[PDB]
PDB file of N, CA and C in Angstrom:
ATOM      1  N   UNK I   2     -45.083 -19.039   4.891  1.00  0.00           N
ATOM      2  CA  UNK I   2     -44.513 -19.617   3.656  1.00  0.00           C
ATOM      3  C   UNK I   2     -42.972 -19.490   3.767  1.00  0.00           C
ATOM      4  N   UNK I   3     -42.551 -19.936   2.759  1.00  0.00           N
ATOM      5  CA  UNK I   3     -40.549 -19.888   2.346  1.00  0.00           C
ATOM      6  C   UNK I   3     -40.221 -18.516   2.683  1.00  0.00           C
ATOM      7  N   UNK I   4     -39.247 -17.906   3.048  1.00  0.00           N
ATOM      8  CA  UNK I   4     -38.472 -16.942   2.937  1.00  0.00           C
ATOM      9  C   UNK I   4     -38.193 -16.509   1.477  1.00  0.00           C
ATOM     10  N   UNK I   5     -38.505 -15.669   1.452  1.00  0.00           N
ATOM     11  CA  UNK I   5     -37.951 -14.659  -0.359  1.00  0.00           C
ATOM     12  C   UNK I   5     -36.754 -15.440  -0.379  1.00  0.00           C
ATOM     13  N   UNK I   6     -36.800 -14.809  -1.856  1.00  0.00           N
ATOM     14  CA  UNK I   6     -35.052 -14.789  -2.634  1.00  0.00           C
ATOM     15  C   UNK I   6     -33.978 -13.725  -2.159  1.00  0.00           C
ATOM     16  N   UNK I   7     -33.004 -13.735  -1.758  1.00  0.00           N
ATOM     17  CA  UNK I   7     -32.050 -12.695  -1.545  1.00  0.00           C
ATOM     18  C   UNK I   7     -32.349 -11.823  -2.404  1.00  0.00           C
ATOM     19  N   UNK I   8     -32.115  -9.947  -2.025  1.00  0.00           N
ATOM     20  CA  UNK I   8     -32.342  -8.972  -2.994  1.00  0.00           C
ATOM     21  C   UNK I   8     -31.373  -8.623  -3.962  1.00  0.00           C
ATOM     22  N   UNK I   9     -31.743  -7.860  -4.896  1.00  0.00           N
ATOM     23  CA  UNK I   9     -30.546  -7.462  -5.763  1.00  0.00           C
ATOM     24  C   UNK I   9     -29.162  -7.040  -5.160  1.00  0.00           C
ATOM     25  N   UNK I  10     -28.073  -6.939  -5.926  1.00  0.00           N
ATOM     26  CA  UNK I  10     -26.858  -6.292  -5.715  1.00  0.00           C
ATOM     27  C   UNK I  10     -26.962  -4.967  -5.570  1.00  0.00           C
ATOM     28  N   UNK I  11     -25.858  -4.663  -4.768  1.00  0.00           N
ATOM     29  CA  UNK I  11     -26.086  -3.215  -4.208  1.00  0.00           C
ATOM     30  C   UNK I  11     -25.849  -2.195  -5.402  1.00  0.00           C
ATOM     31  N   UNK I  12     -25.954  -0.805  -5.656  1.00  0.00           N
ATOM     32  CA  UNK I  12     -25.645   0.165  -6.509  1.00  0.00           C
ATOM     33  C   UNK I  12     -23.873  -0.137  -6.103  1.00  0.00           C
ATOM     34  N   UNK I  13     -22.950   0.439  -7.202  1.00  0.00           N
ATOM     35  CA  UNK I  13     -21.865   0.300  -7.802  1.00  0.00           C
ATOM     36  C   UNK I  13     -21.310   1.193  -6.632  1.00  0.00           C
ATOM     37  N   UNK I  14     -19.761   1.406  -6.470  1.00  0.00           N
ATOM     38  CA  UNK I  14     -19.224   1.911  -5.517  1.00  0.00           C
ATOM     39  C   UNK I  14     -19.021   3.434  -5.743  1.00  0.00           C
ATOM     40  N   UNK I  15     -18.288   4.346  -5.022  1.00  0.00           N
ATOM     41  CA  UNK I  15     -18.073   5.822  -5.475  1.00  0.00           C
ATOM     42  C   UNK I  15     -16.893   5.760  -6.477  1.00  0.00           C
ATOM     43  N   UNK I  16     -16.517   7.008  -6.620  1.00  0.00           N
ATOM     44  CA  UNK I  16     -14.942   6.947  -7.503  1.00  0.00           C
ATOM     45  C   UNK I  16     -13.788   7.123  -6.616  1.00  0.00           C
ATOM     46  N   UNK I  17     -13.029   6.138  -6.884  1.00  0.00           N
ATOM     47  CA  UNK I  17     -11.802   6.460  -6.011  1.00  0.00           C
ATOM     48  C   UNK I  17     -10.995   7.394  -5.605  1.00  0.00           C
ATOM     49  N   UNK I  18     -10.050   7.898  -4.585  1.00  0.00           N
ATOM     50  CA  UNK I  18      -9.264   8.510  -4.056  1.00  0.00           C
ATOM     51  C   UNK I  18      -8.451   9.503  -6.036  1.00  0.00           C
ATOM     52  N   UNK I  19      -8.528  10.643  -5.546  1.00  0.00           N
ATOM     53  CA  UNK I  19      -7.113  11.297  -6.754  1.00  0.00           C
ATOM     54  C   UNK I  19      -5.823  10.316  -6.516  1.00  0.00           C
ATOM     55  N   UNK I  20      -5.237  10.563  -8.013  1.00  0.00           N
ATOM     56  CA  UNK I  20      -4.483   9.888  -7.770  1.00  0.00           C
ATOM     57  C   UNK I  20      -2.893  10.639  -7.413  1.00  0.00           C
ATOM     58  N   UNK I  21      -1.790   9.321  -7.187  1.00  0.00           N
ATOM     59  CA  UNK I  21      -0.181  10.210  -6.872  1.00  0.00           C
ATOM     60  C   UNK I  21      -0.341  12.026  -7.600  1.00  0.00           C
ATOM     61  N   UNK I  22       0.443  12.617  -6.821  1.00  0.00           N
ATOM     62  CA  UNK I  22       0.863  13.504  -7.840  1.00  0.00           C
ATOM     63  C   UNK I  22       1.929  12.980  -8.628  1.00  0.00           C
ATOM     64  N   UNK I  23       1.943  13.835  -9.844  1.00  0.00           N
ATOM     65  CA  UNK I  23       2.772  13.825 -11.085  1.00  0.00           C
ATOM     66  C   UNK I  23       4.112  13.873 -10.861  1.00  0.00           C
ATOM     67  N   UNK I  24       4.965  13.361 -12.274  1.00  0.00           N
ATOM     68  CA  UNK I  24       6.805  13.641 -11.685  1.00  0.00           C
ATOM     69  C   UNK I  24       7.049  15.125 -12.081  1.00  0.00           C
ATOM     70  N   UNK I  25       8.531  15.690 -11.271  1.00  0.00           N
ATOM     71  CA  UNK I  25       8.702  16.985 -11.873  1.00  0.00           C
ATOM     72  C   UNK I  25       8.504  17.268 -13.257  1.00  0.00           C
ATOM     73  N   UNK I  26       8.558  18.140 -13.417  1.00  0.00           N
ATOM     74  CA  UNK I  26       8.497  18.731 -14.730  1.00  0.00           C
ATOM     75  C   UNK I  26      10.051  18.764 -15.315  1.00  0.00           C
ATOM     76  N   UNK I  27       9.947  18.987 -16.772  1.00  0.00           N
ATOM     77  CA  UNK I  27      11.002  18.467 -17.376  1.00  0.00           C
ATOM     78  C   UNK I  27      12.059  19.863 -16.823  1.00  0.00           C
ATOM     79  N   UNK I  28      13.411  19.921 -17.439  1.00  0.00           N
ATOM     80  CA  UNK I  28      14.032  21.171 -17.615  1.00  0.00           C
ATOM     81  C   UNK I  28      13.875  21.980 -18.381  1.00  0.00           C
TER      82      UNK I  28
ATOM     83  N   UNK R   2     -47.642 -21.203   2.607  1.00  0.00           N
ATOM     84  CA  UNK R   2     -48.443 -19.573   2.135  1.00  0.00           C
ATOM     85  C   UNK R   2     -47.036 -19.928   0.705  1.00  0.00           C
ATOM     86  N   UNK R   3     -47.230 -18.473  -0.112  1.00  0.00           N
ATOM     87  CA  UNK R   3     -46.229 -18.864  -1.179  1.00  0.00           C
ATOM     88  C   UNK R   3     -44.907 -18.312  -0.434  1.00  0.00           C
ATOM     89  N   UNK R   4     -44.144 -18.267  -1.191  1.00  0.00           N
ATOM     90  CA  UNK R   4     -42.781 -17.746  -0.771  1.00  0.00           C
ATOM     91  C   UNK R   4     -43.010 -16.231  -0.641  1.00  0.00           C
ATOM     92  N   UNK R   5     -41.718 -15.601   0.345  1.00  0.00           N
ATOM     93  CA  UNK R   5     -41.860 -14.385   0.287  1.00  0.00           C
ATOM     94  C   UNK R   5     -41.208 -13.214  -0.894  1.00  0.00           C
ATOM     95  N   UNK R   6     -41.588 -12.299  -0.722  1.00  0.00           N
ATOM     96  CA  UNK R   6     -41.138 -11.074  -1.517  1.00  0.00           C
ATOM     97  C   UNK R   6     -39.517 -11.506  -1.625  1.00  0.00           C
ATOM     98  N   UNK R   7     -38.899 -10.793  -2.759  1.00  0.00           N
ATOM     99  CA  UNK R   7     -37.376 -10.798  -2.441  1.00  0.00           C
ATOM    100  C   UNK R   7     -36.825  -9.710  -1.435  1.00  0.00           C
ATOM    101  N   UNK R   8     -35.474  -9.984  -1.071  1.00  0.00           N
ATOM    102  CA  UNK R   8     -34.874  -9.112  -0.539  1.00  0.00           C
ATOM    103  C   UNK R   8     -34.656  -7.716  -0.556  1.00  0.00           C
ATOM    104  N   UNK R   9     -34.114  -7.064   0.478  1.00  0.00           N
ATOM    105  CA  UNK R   9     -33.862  -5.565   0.485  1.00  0.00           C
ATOM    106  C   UNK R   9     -32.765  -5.570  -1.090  1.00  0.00           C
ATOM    107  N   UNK R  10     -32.227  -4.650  -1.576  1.00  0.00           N
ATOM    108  CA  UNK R  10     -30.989  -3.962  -2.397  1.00  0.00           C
ATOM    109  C   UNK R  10     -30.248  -4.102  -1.212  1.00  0.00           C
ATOM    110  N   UNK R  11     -28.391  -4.735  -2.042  1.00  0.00           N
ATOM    111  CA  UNK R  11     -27.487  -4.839  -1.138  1.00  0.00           C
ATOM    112  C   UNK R  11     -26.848  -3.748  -1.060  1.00  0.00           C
ATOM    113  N   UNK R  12     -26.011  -3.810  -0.225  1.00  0.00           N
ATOM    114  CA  UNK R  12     -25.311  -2.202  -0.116  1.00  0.00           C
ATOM    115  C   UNK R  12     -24.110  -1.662  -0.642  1.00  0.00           C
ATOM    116  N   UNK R  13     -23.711  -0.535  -1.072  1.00  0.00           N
ATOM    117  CA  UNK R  13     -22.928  -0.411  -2.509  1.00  0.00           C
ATOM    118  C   UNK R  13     -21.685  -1.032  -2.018  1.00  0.00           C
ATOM    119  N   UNK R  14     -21.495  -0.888  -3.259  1.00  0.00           N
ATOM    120  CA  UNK R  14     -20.015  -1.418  -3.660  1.00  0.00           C
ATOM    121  C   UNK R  14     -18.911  -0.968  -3.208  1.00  0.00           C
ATOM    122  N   UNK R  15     -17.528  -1.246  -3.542  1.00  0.00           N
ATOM    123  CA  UNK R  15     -16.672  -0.758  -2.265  1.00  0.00           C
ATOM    124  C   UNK R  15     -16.019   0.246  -3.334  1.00  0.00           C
ATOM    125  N   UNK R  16     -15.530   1.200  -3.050  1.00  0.00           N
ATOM    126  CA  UNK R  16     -14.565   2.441  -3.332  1.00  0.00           C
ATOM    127  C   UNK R  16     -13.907   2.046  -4.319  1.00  0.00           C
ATOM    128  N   UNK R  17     -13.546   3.072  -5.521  1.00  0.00           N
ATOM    129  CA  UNK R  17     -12.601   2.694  -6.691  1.00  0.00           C
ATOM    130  C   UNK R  17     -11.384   2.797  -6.155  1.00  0.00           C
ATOM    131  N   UNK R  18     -10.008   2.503  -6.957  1.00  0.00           N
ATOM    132  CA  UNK R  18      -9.129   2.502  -7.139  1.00  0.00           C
ATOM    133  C   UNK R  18      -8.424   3.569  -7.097  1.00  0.00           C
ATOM    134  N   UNK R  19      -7.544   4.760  -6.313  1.00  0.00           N
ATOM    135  CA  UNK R  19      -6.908   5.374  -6.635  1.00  0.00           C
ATOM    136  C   UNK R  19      -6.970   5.484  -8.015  1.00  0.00           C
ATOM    137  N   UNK R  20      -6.764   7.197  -8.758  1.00  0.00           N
ATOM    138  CA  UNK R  20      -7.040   7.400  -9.798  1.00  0.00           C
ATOM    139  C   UNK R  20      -5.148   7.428 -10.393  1.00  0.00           C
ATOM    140  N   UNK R  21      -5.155   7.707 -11.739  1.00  0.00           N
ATOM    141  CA  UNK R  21      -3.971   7.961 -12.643  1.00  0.00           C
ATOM    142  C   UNK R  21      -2.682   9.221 -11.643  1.00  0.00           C
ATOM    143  N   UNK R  22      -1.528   8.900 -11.801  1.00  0.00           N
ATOM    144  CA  UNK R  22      -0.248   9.770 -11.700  1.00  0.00           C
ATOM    145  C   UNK R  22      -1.375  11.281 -12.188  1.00  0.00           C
ATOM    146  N   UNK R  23      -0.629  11.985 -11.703  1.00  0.00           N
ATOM    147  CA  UNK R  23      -0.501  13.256 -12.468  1.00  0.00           C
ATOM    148  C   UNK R  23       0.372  13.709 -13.886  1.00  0.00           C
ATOM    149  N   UNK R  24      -0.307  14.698 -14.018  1.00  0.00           N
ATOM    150  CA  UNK R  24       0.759  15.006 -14.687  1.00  0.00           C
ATOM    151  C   UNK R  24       2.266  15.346 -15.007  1.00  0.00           C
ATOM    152  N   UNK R  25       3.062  15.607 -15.558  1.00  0.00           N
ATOM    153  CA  UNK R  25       4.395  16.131 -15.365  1.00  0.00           C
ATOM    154  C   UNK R  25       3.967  17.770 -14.750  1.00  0.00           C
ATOM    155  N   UNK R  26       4.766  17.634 -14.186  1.00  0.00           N
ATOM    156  CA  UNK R  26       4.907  19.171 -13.404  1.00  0.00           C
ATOM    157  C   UNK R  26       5.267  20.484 -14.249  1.00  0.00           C
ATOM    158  N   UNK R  27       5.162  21.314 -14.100  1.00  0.00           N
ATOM    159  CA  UNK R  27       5.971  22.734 -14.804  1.00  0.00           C
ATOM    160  C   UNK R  27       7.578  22.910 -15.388  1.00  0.00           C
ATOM    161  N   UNK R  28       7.791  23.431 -16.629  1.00  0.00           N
ATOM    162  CA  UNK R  28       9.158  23.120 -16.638  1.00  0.00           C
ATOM    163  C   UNK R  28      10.509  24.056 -15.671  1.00  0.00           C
TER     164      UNK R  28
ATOM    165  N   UNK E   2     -44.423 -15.697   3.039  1.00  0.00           N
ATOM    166  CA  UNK E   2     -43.563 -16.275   3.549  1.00  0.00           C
ATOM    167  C   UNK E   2     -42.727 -14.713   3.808  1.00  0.00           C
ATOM    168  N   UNK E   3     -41.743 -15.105   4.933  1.00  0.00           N
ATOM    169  CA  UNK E   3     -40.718 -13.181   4.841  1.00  0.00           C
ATOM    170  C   UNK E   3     -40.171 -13.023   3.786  1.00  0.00           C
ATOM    171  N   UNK E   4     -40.127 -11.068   3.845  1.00  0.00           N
ATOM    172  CA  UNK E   4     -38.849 -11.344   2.414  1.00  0.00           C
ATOM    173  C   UNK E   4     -37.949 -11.715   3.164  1.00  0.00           C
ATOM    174  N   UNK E   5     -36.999 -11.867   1.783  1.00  0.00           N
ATOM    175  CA  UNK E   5     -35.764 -12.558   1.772  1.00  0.00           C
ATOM    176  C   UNK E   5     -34.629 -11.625   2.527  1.00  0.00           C
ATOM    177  N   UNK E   6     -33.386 -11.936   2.267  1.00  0.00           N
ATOM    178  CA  UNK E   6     -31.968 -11.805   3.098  1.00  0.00           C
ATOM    179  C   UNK E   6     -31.552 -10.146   2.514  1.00  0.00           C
ATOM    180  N   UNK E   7     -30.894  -9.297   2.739  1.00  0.00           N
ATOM    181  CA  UNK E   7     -30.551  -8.332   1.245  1.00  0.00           C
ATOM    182  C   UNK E   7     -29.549  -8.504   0.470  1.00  0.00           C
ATOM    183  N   UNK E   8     -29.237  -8.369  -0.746  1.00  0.00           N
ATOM    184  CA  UNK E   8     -28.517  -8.859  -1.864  1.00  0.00           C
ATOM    185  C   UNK E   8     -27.110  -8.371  -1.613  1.00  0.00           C
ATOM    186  N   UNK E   9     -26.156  -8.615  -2.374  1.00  0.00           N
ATOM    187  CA  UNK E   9     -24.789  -8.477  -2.067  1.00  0.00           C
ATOM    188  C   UNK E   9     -24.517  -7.362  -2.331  1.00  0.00           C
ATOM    189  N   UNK E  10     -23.281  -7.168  -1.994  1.00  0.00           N
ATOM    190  CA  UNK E  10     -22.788  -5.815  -2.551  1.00  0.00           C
ATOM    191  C   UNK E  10     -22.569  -5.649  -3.349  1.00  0.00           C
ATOM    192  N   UNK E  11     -22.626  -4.384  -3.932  1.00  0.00           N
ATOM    193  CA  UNK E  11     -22.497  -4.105  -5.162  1.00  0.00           C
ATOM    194  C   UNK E  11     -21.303  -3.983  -6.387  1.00  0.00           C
ATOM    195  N   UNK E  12     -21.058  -3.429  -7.138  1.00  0.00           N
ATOM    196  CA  UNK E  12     -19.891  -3.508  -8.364  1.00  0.00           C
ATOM    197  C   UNK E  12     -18.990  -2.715  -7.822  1.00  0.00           C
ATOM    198  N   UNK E  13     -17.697  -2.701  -7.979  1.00  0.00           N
ATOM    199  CA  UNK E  13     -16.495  -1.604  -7.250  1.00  0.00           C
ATOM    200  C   UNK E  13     -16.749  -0.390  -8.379  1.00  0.00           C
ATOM    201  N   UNK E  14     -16.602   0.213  -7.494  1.00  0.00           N
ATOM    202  CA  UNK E  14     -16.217   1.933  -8.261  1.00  0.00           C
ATOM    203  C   UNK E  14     -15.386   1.788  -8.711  1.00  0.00           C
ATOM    204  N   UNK E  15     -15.459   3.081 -10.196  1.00  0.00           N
ATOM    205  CA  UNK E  15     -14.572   3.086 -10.829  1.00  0.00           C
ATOM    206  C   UNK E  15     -13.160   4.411 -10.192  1.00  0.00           C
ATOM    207  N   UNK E  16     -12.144   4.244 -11.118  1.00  0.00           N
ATOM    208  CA  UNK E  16     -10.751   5.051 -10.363  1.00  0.00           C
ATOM    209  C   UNK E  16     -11.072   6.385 -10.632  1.00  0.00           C
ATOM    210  N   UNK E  17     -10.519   6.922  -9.383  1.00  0.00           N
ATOM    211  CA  UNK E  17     -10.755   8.335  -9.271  1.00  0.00           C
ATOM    212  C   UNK E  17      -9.664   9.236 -10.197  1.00  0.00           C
ATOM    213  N   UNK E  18     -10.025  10.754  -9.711  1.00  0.00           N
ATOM    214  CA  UNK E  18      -9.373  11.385 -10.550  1.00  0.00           C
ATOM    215  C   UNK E  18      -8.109  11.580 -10.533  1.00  0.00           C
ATOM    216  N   UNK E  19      -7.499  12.116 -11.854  1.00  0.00           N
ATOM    217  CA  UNK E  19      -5.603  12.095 -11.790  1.00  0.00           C
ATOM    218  C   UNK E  19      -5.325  12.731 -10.938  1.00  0.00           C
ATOM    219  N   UNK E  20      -4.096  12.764 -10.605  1.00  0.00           N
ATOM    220  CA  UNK E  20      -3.714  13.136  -9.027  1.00  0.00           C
ATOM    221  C   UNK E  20      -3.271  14.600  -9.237  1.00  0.00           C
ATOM    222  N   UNK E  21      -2.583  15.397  -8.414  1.00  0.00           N
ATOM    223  CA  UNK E  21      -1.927  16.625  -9.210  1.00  0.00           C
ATOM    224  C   UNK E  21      -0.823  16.498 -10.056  1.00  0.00           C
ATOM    225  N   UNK E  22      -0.941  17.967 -10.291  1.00  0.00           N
ATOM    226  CA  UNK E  22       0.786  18.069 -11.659  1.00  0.00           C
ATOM    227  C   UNK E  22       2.203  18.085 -10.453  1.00  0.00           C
ATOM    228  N   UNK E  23       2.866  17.559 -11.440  1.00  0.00           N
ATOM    229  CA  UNK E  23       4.161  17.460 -10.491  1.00  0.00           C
ATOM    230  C   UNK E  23       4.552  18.990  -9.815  1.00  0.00           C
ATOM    231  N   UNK E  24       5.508  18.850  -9.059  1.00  0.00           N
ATOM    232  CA  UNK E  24       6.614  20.352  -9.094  1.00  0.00           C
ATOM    233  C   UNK E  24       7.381  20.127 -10.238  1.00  0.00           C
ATOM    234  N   UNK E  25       7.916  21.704 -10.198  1.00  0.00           N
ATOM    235  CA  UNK E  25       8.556  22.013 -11.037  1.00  0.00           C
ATOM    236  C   UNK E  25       9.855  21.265 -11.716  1.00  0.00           C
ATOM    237  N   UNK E  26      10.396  21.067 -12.631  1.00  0.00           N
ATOM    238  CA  UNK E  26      11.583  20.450 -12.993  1.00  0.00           C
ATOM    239  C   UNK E  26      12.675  21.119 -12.324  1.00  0.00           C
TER     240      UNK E  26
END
């Protein structure tokens, strides 16, 4: 018979990289 | 014959985004 | 009939965590 339907979409990605560190701190 | 089953699950998604600056630093 | 092809990829991740605290002022 036909070939299936393509399967679902994959599960969602991880969480990204931390981000920059922060600017100095004030005076 | 009928059509086939659907597909496998695709494969995840791609990596988030670098997250937020930090905070300000210590004074 | 075969199964089918496998499905696309998936949704992007969401942004990771804040980065560190600065140095000092």
């Amino acid at each position: 018979g036909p070939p299936g339907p393509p399967g679902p979409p994959g599960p969602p990605g991880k969480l990204g990289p931390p981000g920059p560190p922060g600017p100095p701190g004030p005076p």
